[PDB]
Amino acid sequence: AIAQLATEYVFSDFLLKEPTEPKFKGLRLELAVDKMVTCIAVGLPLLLISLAFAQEISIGTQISCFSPSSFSWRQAAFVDSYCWAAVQQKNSLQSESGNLPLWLHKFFPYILLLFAILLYLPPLFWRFAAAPHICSDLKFIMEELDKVYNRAIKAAKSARDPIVEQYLKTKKNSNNLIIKYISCRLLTLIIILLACIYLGYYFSLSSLSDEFVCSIKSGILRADSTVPDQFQCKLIAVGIFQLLSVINLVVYVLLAPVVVYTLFVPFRQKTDVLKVYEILPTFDVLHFKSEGYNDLSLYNLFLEENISEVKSYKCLKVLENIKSSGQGIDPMLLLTNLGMI
């Protein structure tokens, strides 16, 4: 049913499943925009494949060939099957457009699924090659961040009564994690552009290329005179393929700019979460995180992403907002907060 495909591929959490493992519990490891780009770019061709053969659009078989009236039911079935298998053998069939459109019309579902798989590959390589490293580092950085905030509030309360920073400075040096990231993004962009080219070509087909003339006259049927010289076959469901092909092309050409934008990782590093903790006195008062094609920018993005899960950040952010209001003071209201755990 058309509605079941809808549920399964848009309304269900298809490819939105969190890692079924206690190792990554609430850690994202994939920027939300990357997750949605992958979800669209991969699930859309699958949904389109499923729609192209929905029982309420499909009339029946994919090919029909109009045998003579003298032919029995089984002879007509033979003609259909032979011509279907003969879209490959170029000698038997004669079409105005050529054989390549016939190939493309027969194997449209396979090509769309191939594009889905190729678009799924780079996210897989990211999830299996570079995800655990950043998961461990980000989790450790968040724990140390919490410890730093605890030290600051403990010092403030005691007055009333930077290992993580250096690790960040270290990550500022290496660029393994960023070349991996932009390589997956670049491959996604390349595959999306190749898919756009292919779909634009396919939609541009003559729309009469689904009609080809086929001849079952190889072998001993060559001498058979009860068999006409050639049959008029038509590939049903090519119009559906071309309509779905233009839909896919529209979505992919809208999606490509998003991938290109993600390609600029430093530009996206904005709304510095580190600034909030920099407001705290104990932590060094510097952003110390921007302006480079280095793993530090990646870690900044992933910190902005997974930073909402730590309650210490939440408290410090609301304190910074009150500072924007500018009514009280940071240490007094922080001691009033009482949000250590």
Ligand X SMILES: CC(C)CCC[C@@H](C)[C@H]1CC[C@H]2[C@@H]3CC=C4C[C@@H](O)CC[C@]4(C)[C@H]3CC[C@]12C
Interface residues with ligand DGA (CB under 6 A) are 9-10, 16, 32, 35-36, 39-40, 43-44, 47, 117, 124, 128, 251, 254-255, 258
Minimum CB–partner distance for residue 144 and ligand 3PE (Å): 22
Helices 311-325/131-160 angle, 10° precision:
60
Q: Of 32 and 159, which CB lies nearer to ligand DGA in the complex structure?
A: 32
Q: Using CB under 6 A, pick the residue from 6, 77, 187, 243 that binds ligand 3PE.
A: 187
Residue 204, binding choice from ligand 3PE, a second copy, ligand X, none, Cβ under 5 to 8 Å by partner class: ligand X
Minimum CB–partner distance for residue 132 and ligand DGA (Å): 12
**Whats the size of the chain, residue-wise?**
341
Minimum CB–partner distance for residue 251 and a second copy (Å): 11
Total of chain residues touching ligand PTY, rule CB under 6 A: 20
Residue 97, binding choice from ligand X, ligand DGA, a second copy, none, Cβ under 5 to 8 Å by partner class: none
Distance CA 37, CA 255 (A): 7
Query: What backbone phi and psi angles, to 5 degrees, belong to 75?
Result: -65, -40
Distance CA 118, CA 177 (A): 22
Nearest residue to 154 via CA among 340, 341, 318? 340
Cα 189-195-198 angle, rounded to 5 deg: 145
Q: How far apart are the first and last CA of the chain?
A: 50
Q: Give the CA diameter of the chain.
A: 110
Residue 310, binding choice from ligand PTY, ligand X, ligand 3PE, none, Cβ under 5 to 8 Å by partner class: none
Query: Among residue numbers 28 through 67, which ones bind ligand 3PE (CB under 6 A)?
Result: 31-33, 36
Query: Among residue numbers 244 through 273, which ones bind ligand 3PE (CB under 6 A)?
Result: 257-258, 261, 268, 270
Cα 181-139-187 angle, rounded to 5 deg: 10
Q: Is 291 in the site for a second copy (CB under 8 A)?
A: no
Q: Of 61 and 290, which CB lies nearer to a second copy in the complex structure?
A: 61
Q: Is 111 in the site for ligand PTY (CB under 6 A)?
A: yes
Burial class of residue 95 in the structure, from the number of CB atoms within 10 Å of its CB (0-12 exposed, 13-18 middle, 19+ buried): buried
Q: Is 175 in the site for a second copy (CB under 8 A)?
A: no
Kindly list the distances between the CA atom of residue 184 and the CA atoms of 15, 54, 213, 313, in Å, as whole numbers in the listed order. 18, 33, 45, 31
Q: Of 150 and 175, which CB lies nearer to ligand 3PE in the complex structure?
A: 175
Residue 335, binding choice from ligand PTY, a second copy, ligand DGA, none, Cβ under 5 to 8 Å by partner class: none
Q: Convert residues 191-230 into a mask of x (bound to a second copy by CB under 8 A) and - (unbound).
A: ----------------xx-xx-x--x-xxxx----x---x
Query: Among residue numbers 236 through 265, which ones bind a second copy (CB under 8 A)?
Result: 236-239, 243
Q: How many CA atoms lie within 13 A of 287 on its CB side?
A: 12
Q: Which residues bind ligand X (CB under 6 A)?
A: 100, 193-194, 196-198, 200-201, 204, 253
DSSP codes joined into one string, 182-251: HHHHHHHHHHHHHHHHHHHHHHTS-SSTTEEEE---SGGGGS-SSS-S-EEEEETTHHHHHHHHHHHHHH
Q: Is 163 in the site for a second copy (CB under 8 A)?
A: yes
Q: Of 32 and 341, which CB lies nearer to ligand DGA in the complex structure?
A: 32
Q: Is 122 in the site for ligand 3PE (CB under 6 A)?
A: yes
Query: Among residue numbers 205 through 244, which ones bind ligand PTY (CB under 6 A)?
Result: 205, 207, 242-243
String of b and e for 242-277 (b: at least 16 CB within 10 Å)? bebbebbbebbeebbebbeebeebbeebeebbbebb
Query: Among residue numbers 119 through 158, which ones bind a second copy (CB under 8 A)?
Result: 120, 128, 132-133, 136, 140, 147
Residues facing residue 234 across a β-bridge: 64, 211
Residue 287, binding choice from ligand DGA, a second copy, ligand 3PE, none, Cβ under 5 to 8 Å by partner class: none
